[PDB]
Structure formats: C-alpha cells, structure tokens
Curated annotation (Swiss-Prot), chains A, B:
Family: Belongs to the UPF0102 family.
Shown chain mapped onto the complete sequence: 23 to 130 of 130
Name used for this protein in its record: UPF0102 protein RPA0323
Segments passing through the bilayer: none
GO molecular function: nucleic acid binding
Domain of life: Bacteria
Length: 102, 102
C-alpha cells in the first residue's frame, strides 16, 4: 500500500504508471513512470536521504533490462527517483535521488 | 594481457590475487586482490577517470556474490579500484576509483 500510495501520488502529479514491481534476474524497480519525454525509475521507501550502492546497482540493472525491452524509450530522458512514504503525511518525491549519468 | 599486466603489477605492489575474470550471473570483476585486511575489486581498462554507472552496478553485484561465498572476507575492508593499461607506460592504479560505501 506504500507502493499504491506512491503510484497514486505520481498520477496526481501528471505521471503515467508503466510498470509496478518490475522484476528482472538482476534487479527490480518499484515503479516505472512517465511524463512527457521523461522516464522515471522510482524506488519506494518507508521514511536527508541516500540510496544504497546495492539498491542503486539493482535499480540500474533493472532499468537496463526495461529499456532494452521498450525501444520506444531507448532515447528518452531517464531519471532515478525515490518516494518516501511516512505515516501522517503526503508522499515525498525525491526526483533524481541518484545520478546514473555517463 | 592487460589483465595479466594489471595482476603482475598488483603482485609487485604487495597484493595477492584471489580471482581473475570472476563471473557471476549479474556481473563480473577483472581482478580480486588482497593486501592485509583489505579486499580490492579491480576493473582493468585500456587507458581523469570515471567508472560508468553500468560497470559500477555490475562490479557491485559481482562483489556481493563473491563476498557471500567467501565468509572469511565478510568483515574485511572493501575497496573498488581501477587499473588503466596504456601502451608505453606502467599500469596506473586508481584505488577507490568509486565509492560503494553505505
């Protein structure tokens, strides 16, 4: 329901959800969302903030698998996000929570 | 022979080679080397310098697989390195080429 909360939030903020709980052999992505020419790969976390090298490794590995199977996004802007879900407050969206830029 | 060059260099610099061309389902490590309580996971590259998010993802994934299967290093100091191999010069060792610290 943290994941449903996060997705509902992103939809209210103008995103389309492309995948939920996306699994591949080498990683996973809680949400894949799109707005305009931008694809966001989103980690949902129970609530500064810093993504673990392990999670980064796994989300990058999963993004790679996703992009390969969705040629329509081969040249889209990619962004790695977090959403923090805490008990008595709105989801907090951290766009670009880490940089996977070359 | 870039890999042999790198390993020979590290041995001259006091390291023991634990693995060469280490493969796992989700990544690979060109050299695993040890000195004292320190394990170095080393990417060998033909010659500042910056490891790609993809390679980082893969070397971290492979380090994780390695560490799990070598309990003796569960609590060792870990470092991620690069060695640059260029044509008319000694290997260049970049210890801690990236940070995988939590």
């Amino acid at each position: 329901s943290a994941e449903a909360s996060a997705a509902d939030y992103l939809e209210r903020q103008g995103y389309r959800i492309l995948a939920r709980r996306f699994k591949t052999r080498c990683g996973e992505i809680d949400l894949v969302a799109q707005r305009d020419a931008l694809v966001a790969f989103v980690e949902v976390k129970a609530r500064a903030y810093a993504v673990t090298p392990r999670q980064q490794s796994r989300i990058v590995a999963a993004a790679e698998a996703w992009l390969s199977r969705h040629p329509e996004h081969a040249m889209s802007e990619l962004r790695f996000d977090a959403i923090l879900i805490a008990p008595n407050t709105a989801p907090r969206h951290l766009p670009g929570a880490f940089d996977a830029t070359p």
